[PDB]
Symmetry: C5
Subunit: 320 residues, 5 copies
Amino acid sequence: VAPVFTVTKFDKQGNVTSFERKKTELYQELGLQARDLRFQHVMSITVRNNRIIMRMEYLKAVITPECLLILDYRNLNLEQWLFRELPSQLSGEGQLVTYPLPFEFRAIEALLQYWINTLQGKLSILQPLILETLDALVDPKHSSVDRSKLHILLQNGKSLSELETDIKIFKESILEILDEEELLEELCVSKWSDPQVFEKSSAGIDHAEEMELLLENYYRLADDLSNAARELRVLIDDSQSIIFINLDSHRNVMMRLNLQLTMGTFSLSLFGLMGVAFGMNLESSLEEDHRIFWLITGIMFMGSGLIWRRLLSFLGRQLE
Amino acid sequence: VAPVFTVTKFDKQGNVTSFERKKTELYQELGLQARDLRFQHVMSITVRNNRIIMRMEYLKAVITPECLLILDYRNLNLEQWLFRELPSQLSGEGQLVTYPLPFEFRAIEALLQYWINTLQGKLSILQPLILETLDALVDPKHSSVDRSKLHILLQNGKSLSELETDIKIFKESILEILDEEELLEELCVSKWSDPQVFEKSSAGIDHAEEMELLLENYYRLADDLSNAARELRVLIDDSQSIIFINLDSHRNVMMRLNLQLTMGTFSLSLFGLMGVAFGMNLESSLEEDHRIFWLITGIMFMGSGLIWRRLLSFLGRQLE
Amino acid sequence: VAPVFTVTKFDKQGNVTSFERKKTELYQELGLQARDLRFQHVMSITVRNNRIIMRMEYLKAVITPECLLILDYRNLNLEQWLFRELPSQLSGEGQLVTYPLPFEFRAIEALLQYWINTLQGKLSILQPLILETLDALVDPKHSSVDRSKLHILLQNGKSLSELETDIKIFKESILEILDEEELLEELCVSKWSDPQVFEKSSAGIDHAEEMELLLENYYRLADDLSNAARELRVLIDDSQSIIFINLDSHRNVMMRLNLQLTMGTFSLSLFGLMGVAFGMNLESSLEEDHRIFWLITGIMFMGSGLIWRRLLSFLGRQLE
Amino acid sequence: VAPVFTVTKFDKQGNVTSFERKKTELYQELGLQARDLRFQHVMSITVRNNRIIMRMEYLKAVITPECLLILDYRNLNLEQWLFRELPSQLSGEGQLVTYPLPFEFRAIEALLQYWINTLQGKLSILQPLILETLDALVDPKHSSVDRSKLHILLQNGKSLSELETDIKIFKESILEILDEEELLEELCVSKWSDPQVFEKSSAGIDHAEEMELLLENYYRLADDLSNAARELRVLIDDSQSIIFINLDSHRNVMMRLNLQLTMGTFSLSLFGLMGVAFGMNLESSLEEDHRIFWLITGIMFMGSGLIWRRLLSFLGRQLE
Amino acid sequence: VAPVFTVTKFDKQGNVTSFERKKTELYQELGLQARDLRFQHVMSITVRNNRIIMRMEYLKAVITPECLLILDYRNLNLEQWLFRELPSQLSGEGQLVTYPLPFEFRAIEALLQYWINTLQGKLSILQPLILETLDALVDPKHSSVDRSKLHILLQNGKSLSELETDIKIFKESILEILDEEELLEELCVSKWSDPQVFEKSSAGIDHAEEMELLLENYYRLADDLSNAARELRVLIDDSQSIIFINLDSHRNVMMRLNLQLTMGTFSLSLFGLMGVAFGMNLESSLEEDHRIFWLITGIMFMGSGLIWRRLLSFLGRQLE
Ligand SMILES: [Cl-]
Ligand SMILES: [Mg+2]
Ligand SMILES: [Mg+2]
């Protein structure tokens, strides 16, 4: 009946243990209040009672000087990352560069690396799709654009805006932590767990400096991602403007050709009316004449041609 | 004759009392000047004479170390919240996380929670409507868009802009309070009411820190709301651009088809003029010939077809 | 020959005296240099030689600890405000809330109140006009918009942009003064006129704090005005986008209907050409037949209808 | 062979001397390095070795406590300003307000006044042209706009953007100098030339304060110029939007009228086809009847009218 | 098997040596960790263990107090710059202005000069192309624009956006270094290599001040580049708006002319229908009359002309 957390616990030795714990039991074990683990804010990093609470959207983590906890990890495709890369990164030959540093450094590096890799993967999925859709859409030899490609571009633009917002909030959180030295000092949970021990254990290694360098690295990576996303948005806008110009130019060409054909039709209809005037079954004084028929036909055709040419010249003058 | 406030008073025990009090009487009771309770600024939080004055649009509140007052609460549908949730939140088993803290913490938490819930409700009402309107409007199989849906989208966009402005001003007020530690210290009215008593009453609990954490929580919630609203605005703009492109593409397709039909009509009218030339009641030298009629009809139809095909090819060349 | 100021002087007792004074004489009386009273900057507030120099566009004022001066007040419709409200506000039962404070507080409050009321009046004039113009323009049942209303909207948008710039510069000046405590202290001219006297005269009343609260009040009012103006601009842009979409949709509907009618005309002209082929005065082998005439007429009409239906179906397929 | 500066030297007495000096000789005389006088940055003000180096685009100046130098003044139309106003401003009855102050104050005031006057002149040239072009272009009674006026507007908009950038960089330089008190102190070259002498020479006059006031004056003037330029840009954008709406409305009106005429033509052609069906030279059973001709003509005309009216009503229903 | 760096080493004497070194060997020689030389961030400047690590996109450099290293220099067309200009700049008569300063000053100046020259070259390539493309596109005498030029403009706009982003990140890095004095002090690697020696070696020359001046120079150059790029973007947007207006105006002119021709055709077809009514082979009572034929023809032509004139007048009234 009581709410519970599905907890994946990684020790300092990289051992992984999955279980479920009551919320009050977790609060008692971690020495934290209920309000600390509400996880109400997406992309939030805080330090409460010497414990690091982190949320990156669906990823909720609690870092202790002794262990790491992942909360609500089910039905999120996190199993591969949790049980394949994390043990190796924390307690193996992974790509982490904070192994000699205390456990919290490795934990923060792993979490930030996973989030930055997720953002990079989203961008690397979105970029080729948007690029090829724009290339198809801005093709100058198409009179009209493909509307299914327009729907695809709209969906990809929505996804790109969401990704850009995620990168922005990640950058904001990292920069807020980096700006204040107090937060950087608080992030060093192992240092403050036993200050007397770490007063001599830290043989010239500044934990705050290492944390600052790690956060600066991840902030720079997120800044590069944000720059790429903004460039993609700008390219999308420019491509949309080019598409508008192409459509307007095609419309103008078709309208000019239709206007020329309308001039031809109007001259043809005028001299056709002139001919039909002689086609009505009313007696005239020109039935007996032999050359009048050919004269009328010739002047009719020649006048149609001349009026069409004059109208074309008038159009050329009007369009300048 | 004198102006009055309709006052809803909540004690430390959660008891609710509704009455009306003269403005001067309220100023005397609260130890505040007339200018303090003007409530001229929407979404303003201030501390005057050890009392917290708050306005969130229509919600005007005065928080004292002993009680809370809601002013001008009538004809605003506030009765349900005032008489159902507030007593439970202040003096019961509500979702407030500041119960062990002094009364002002619970009061501020309740007010900020109500305002943030109002903003979230506005956004959760606006988002599905805007999403479905955009989905209907950006449908690529519609030659023209529904204008009633356009009016609905315009109204919802105005509402979304108003909501975004409200979220922005809420964030600005909260961040202005959070930036300066003096304002955070002033917000702890119970601490400064009896400094001698609270010098020993506060057994290791920092009231300023608790206030900072509460305000940071609500600021983060408002930031998430603002991000969602900005994403909705960006999606609206992108959908409008897609609608423009779709309409232009449909116009281009219809114009091309009309131009092809105009080519057909022009060729038909040209060779029809040629035929009508022989339809006039003028004597010629071809009436006695038998094959001339069928020859003229055949060459007329064939020339119409050939000129139409040539004009279509010319259009294809022009459009590239 | 020498330049002069038309000076309206208000004493501490609210007495008003209008006269003209030579520029050098005014400089000597006020203890100020010529460069101080250039009034080159619109919306500028400064403190020179213990005197407050203020300019709000056409309103130039000099506040002394003993009196207030309005300069160049003629031909600006300022007479009503100068001779009706200002005496009552300074030395009566006006709405000013700084009466117990020294004279400069009342003077600054009156000037800022007049300017904020002018801005509010401009906004309250512009808002209904813009709202009704947009409501008329975004009407979905209009095939075309009213261009006179477009000109009115353009003029009102220019006025709104000017008002927004005025509000922005007012906010900038007030915030620049508020940010630095030195400027706030300098604004208390009565305090620094006789520091020895005011060392004991100020019985617990902080003049700098009162000035800060007054300026914060007026800054918040200006911020609300700026938010309203920005919302109006955003609504104008959204209405323009909606108008564009409505016009494009009407164009598409008219173009589709014209294309259908063009299909009908083309089929009619094709089978009309077929009929005219038999209308020419050339001998054929079908004159004696009786049923051939009705057969040709029937097949002509039926083929016109069938070709029109096929073209309509082709259009439906093309538009998807 | 060696590079040289064309130097115009103004003494403290306003005497002007024009000559040419080798670059190394100028470096030796001014006590400055080669890198100091590169003048690589447009709109840059710096203090090197107690000398003020200023560049405003084409205007390069070096201010010393004893003299002023203008460099590369040829072929820039600077002769009038150099030899007419500068001597009077520096050593006469000019409009400068820093005459009792040391020479560098007058020099800086003259240079900043010239630059601000140049910017004001550019804006006062651009504003009437842009205003009249927009007024001509947004005329609602024009079916189409004048394209030569469009080219003029484009050129003026480019010039306005360049002017706005110049004002922005001028404001940035002035504000960067004003923000740091060290730069303001360094700008007082006469004070630091002989600190022992000026320790008693400055009888209560703060040179840093005077420099701050002068720079604040010029910054406020530049801010007013920037506000005017931004307002002009906003007005240009609004006028462009109004032009777009006007063109779309004219297109819609013309398209509706063309559609009505197309309906008329289609009905006329339908009943004309009906008439032509009886015009073919094929024997029928209605030649002998006398009333059939008039009956057919009457029903033809009446049906044309009725079908045209029905199509117009259908268009009215479709357009809503 | 192990990863290696292709290292180009420049000594203090300008001697160049190209070789390849294992990554671990380079880390040991430079006294740096593996994470220091990841080069994960484009356009990043840092100081680690008294060594300057710089990346400008493809250019990776490590500056030591004794030497400079270029890493991964192959297949980047860097050979000319590496083996022609760098030796002369570092140990010759180059344009560097930091020769008397320690080696790191010359190294930083050379690297920043190369990057700023690359950015200037990119801008000087992009600007004429964009300018000529816009001039061709905004030509008012073209009914339609060239779409190949549109594709060229789109590609150049993408390149310009990339260049603007590069300039922005360069400015951000330089300004981040300049803002904090600690980073400026750290950049002086020779000063901190032997602090005891440089305590007396630096005879009044402040290395931090020289570094600040160099970085300020390069920041100002990058700011000028960014201003030029932003002006180019603004000009591109304005040209696109002008192109839109030109296309709409041409469309309106063509549509008006087509509407006038449609009026003519409609009047011609109406009176042609009137004439054809008399052309059908049905007996009437007007065959014997002689003047009826000419009367009908004359009234037909005159009515066509009059109806066309009336329709033109109606169009003129409608367009206002
Ligand atoms: Cl169009
Ligand atoms: Mg006939
Ligand atoms: Mg359009």
